[PDB]
């Protein structure tokens, strides 16, 4: 299990994450029980489900 403060302490990376979901024109993905937010220059594939760009952690996996 992960907490919100544990996730927010992790660094932001530049790469690709799969199983990406939308939340009002904003993209989110789950990685190591932490939810990351897509920003920067985005390049998407796998029918909007795989996004490459800047991923910043926002919260923990529910």
Identify the CATH number of the domain in which residue 12 sits: 2.30.27.10
Question: Using CA atoms, how far apart are residues 5 and 18, in angstroms rounded to an integer?
Answer: 23
Question: Using CA atoms, how far apart are residues 60 and 2, in angstroms rounded to an integer?
Answer: 6
> According to the entry, how was the structure determined?
X-ray
Q: What residue numbers bound the domain in which 11 lies? A: 1-62
Structure-block tokens of residue 61: 């996996």
Q: Give every CB contact of residue 57 below 8 A, 6+ residues apart in sequence.
A: 7, 8, 10, 12, 34, 35, 36, 37
Say what the resolution is, in angstroms: 2.9
Q: What is the CA radius of gyration of the chain?
A: 11
CA separation (Å) from 25 to 39, 43, 44, 50, 60? 12, 15, 14, 15, 20
How many domains would you assign to the chain?
1
Residue 1 DSSP symbol: -
DSSP 8-43: HHSPPEEEEESS-EESSS-EEEEETTEEEEEEEEEE
Bridge partners (DSSP) of residue 34 are: 31, 60
Q: Measured between alpha carbons, how far apart are the two ends of the chain, in Å?
A: 9
């Amino acid at each position: 299990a992960t907490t919100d403060a544990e996730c927010l302490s992790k660094p932001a990376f530049d790469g690709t994450l799969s199983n990406v979901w939308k939340e009002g024109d904003s993209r989110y993905a789950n990685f190591e029980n932490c939810i990351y937010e897509l920003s920067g220059i985005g390049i998407g594939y796998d029918n909007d489900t795989s996004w490459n760009g800047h991923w910043t952690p926002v919260r923990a996996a529910d």
